[PDB]
Amino acid sequence: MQLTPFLILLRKTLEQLQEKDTGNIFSEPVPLSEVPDYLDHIKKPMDFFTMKQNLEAYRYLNFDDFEEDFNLIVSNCLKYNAKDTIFYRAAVRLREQGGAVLRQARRQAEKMG
Ligand SMILES: COc1cc2c(cc1NS(=O)(=O)c1ccc(Br)cc1C)n(C)c(=O)n2C
16 A cells, blocks of 8 residues: 555545445446356446456556446446346436546546646
8 A cells, every 4th residue: 555645536436436336236247147148248347346456456547547437337237238127227326326426526636636
């Protein structure tokens, strides 16, 4: 830990995004055991555990890169699932609530060098 304000802002933001996912639907990768066709449709799977792993290998260099991976969690879920599903509805709610989180977090990242 050589802690930096930007990396700390990303950690905090990631925690706030995960609090919005109250069902833990997006906490871990979509399980290929349960969803065998998932990678026929989804080129770049993403989830909050993969984001946490990326964060702590310093792969997020700016706020936009981090935001892009969050947006993949949502877009993959809307692409794969039918509208009338728990997963689709959850992704729409996460889009709304997560968007509010990232809007706030971006303002901080803008004050930051
Ligand atoms: C949390 O587990 C899952 C998450 C997802 C997911 C599938 C699962 N796991 S799962 O065993 O298929 C499952 C199926 C039905 C219900 Br109801 C709940 C789960 C977790 N898909 C297709 C997604 O897009 N997401 C985000």
